[PDB]
């Protein structure tokens, strides 16, 4: 996260670290949506152009963390993957359309002060909150600059951007399954996700019921925190029928 700040303890208790076993490194962010299910970006697991194709045995999920590098004894929980489910129409060839994946844990994780699931939006949630200028929050252990790494989880709040502005900022074809967020050059504030943060959550706190909802997944961008560029996010509500289908079947 570029131009963010240290998270408070327990501020993002749904935050998940996807941790590569060998070599030991941060792969991506992710989120906890139940005791058994973790949400992330498909590109964290599958991206053939870079020969990325993780299997369940390649990675671990670390939940309840604050420190990036430390083994947080008596606090974090480490979980193994039973199965990965990538959206079948994830468009890795072109524009990362439908950049979403689910991972089922081998055993359910116990909730605690540090570990707790985020809500997923329904249609009404999405209509109410996904409006230009409304702010959400992105968290992660990714790089602090495009070109280093944080001691603890970082947070930044960023406004949703008008769709024409998003479309005009990039040559990539934008779909209804994406939105963009970030400050404009003229706005003076800064902030973005970066390498290590992708797959993590973009959340908003409903002013109606005071709950946090995961509206987006960090999907893609061009560099990090560049003037006139915006981060792109997978639109979680738009892909909820698939999420429900997978959870209902498996």
């Amino acid at each position: 996260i570029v131009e963010g700040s240290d998270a408070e303890i327990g501020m993002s208790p749904w935050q998940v670290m996807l941790f590569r076993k060998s070599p030991q490194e941060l792969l991506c962010g992710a989120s906890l949506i139940s005791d058994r299910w973790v949400l992330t970006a498909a590109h964290c697991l599958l991206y053939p152009p870079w020969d990325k194709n993780f299997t369940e045995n390649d990675l671990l999920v670390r939940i309840g963390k604050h420190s990036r590098t430390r083994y947080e004894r008596n606090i974090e929980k480490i979980s193994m993957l039973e199965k990965i489910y990538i959206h079948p129409r994830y468009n890795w060839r072109e524009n990362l359309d439908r950049d979403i994946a689910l991972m089922k844990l081998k055993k359910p994780v116990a909730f605690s002060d540090y570990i707790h699931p985020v809500c997923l939006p329904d249609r009404e949630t999405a209509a109410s909150l996904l409006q230009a200028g409304y702010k959400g929050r992105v968290t992660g252990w990714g790089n602090l600059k495009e070109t280093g790494q944080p001691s603890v989880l970082q947070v930044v709040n960023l406004p949703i951007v008008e769709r024409p502005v998003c479309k005009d900022s990039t040559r990539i074809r934008i779909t209804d399954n994406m939105f963009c967020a970030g400050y404009k050059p003229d706005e003076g504030k800064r902030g973005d996700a970066c390498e290590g943060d992708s797959g993590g959550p973009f959340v908003m706190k409903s002013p109606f019921n005071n709950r946090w909802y995961q509206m987006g997944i960090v999907s893609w961008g061009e560099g990090c925190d560049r003037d006139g560029k915006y981060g792109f996010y997978t639109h979680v509500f738009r892909l909820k029928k698939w999420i429900q289908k997978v959870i209902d079947q498996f």
Binding site: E8, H116, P117, Y134, M204, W212
Partner: peptide, 28 residues
């Protein structure tokens, strides 16, 4: 049932340092 309500914040009626920034942006 309790999704999205943080033990160390909403559950105990404490607010984090920047959630007000989000609220203030929700103007419609």
């Amino acid at each position: 049932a309790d999704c999205g309500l943080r033990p160390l914040f909403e559950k105990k009626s404490l607010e984090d340092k920047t959630e007000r920034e989000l609220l203030e942006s929700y103007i419609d």
